[PDB]
Amino acid sequence: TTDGVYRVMTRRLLGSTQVGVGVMQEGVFHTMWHVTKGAALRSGEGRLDPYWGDVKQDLVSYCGPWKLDAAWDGLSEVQLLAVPPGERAKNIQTLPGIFKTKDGDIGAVALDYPAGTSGSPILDKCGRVIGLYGNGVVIKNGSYVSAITQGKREEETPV
Amino acid sequence: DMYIERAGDITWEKDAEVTGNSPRLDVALDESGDFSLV
Ligand SMILES: N=C(N)N[C@@H]1CCCCNC(=O)[C@H](CCCCN)NC(=O)[C@H](CCCCN)NC(=O)Cc2cccc(c2)CNC(=O)CNC1=O
Numbered sequence: 001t002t003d004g005v006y007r008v009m010t011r012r013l014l015g016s017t018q019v020g021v022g023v024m025q026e027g028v029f030h031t032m033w034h035v036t037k038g039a040a041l042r043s044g045e046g047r048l049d050p051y052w053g054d055v056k057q058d059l060v061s062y063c064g065p066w067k068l069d070a071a072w073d074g075l076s077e078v079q080l081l082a083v084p085p086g087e088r089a090k091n092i093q094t095l096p097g098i099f100k101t102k103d104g105d106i107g108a109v110a111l112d113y114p115a116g117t118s119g120s121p122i123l124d125k126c127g128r129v130i131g132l133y134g135n136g137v138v139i140k141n142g143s144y145v146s147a148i149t150q151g152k153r154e155e156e157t158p159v
Numbered sequence: 160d161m162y163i164e165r166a167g168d169i170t171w172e173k174d175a176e177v178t179g180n181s182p183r184l185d186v187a188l189d190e191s192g193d194f195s196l197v
Contacts, residue, residue: 006163019161023169033192042162058192079175083166091172097181101188110179127171137186137194145182147194 001027001043001063005083005121008035018085021119023129029062031119032134032149036060052151058135059151069153070128072096072107078148079123080109080133085116091123099137099147107148109133122148 001024008020008031020035029041029048038060041048053060061067072078078096083089096107109122111133118134131148138144185197 002165004168005166007166009162009164011160011162021166022163024165029163036161039161042160048163055192056188056190077177079171081167081169089167091170091175092179093172093175093177094179095181098183099186099194100183101186103188108182108184110182121169123169123171125171127169129169135192135194137184137196139182139184139196145184 001029001048005081005089007083008041008119018116019118020116020134021083021121023068023119023121023132025129026064026067028064028067030066030068030132030151031060032132033058033060034135035119054151057151058149059132061151066151066153068129068131068151070124070126070130071150072124072130072148074107076125078107078109078130080111081121081123082111082113082117082133083120084114096148097145099145107131108136108145109148110143110145112144
């Protein structure tokens with residue numbers, strides 16, 4: 001569970017398929033729910049068990065609670081650290097648009113990558129992860145816009 | 160067998176390629192995590 005960005009792979013009898021991406025931080029793995037469907041993960045010879053998740057947010061964390069707490073500041077450019085299937089990690093910079101919802105605005109990036117790029121981190125200029133890529137909409141011309149999806153880092157749970 | 164493989168460090172790239180517009184879209188989020196255009 002060393003810090004960094006990881007591909008999420010599935011293997012049956014033949015080869016492997018990249019189904020998504022996630023972020024290891026503070027010993028917790030963070031990805032989008034639709035990548036793993038909230039099931040357990042293998043890391044080397046070790047098993048990562050789901051710990052927290054929320055299908056409406058389309059998020060899940062493994063080994064501990066959600067750790068990523070940075071937020072888009074609402075006006076600065078951001079970078080998608082895209083990790084596409086079969087391709088090296090690459091940074092793409094963009095100025096987010098907005099998903100306007102009855103409950104508030106969500107930053108959103110008009111960047112279109114393969115489905116298995118889901119869970120790639122979106123970064124601020126300090127390199128902090130301000131959300132994960134891959135829950136979005138298809139607009140009229142067929143292109144894609146992803147929410148900047150971020151979870152809540154809860155305060156330490158009592159004892 | 161669903162497993163993870165490290166793919167790199169998380170860093171901001173100086174002088175990165177820029178692209179994409181900044182669409183403003185009315186959307187709804189349902190209890191299953193689906194965004195839809197209104
Ligand atoms: N230019 C496109 N269409 N680009 C995407 C980028 C995915 C980026 C990663 N994210 C996803 O894989 C998610 C998974 C589902 C999450 C649901 N909570 N998906 C989406 O957020 C959208 C949602 C639509 C709104 C739901 N109310 N689903 C799709 O885009 C499905 C779709 C639609 C038309 C055509 C295609 C796919 C064919 N395109 C591909 O095969 C590769 N490209 C993509 O699929």
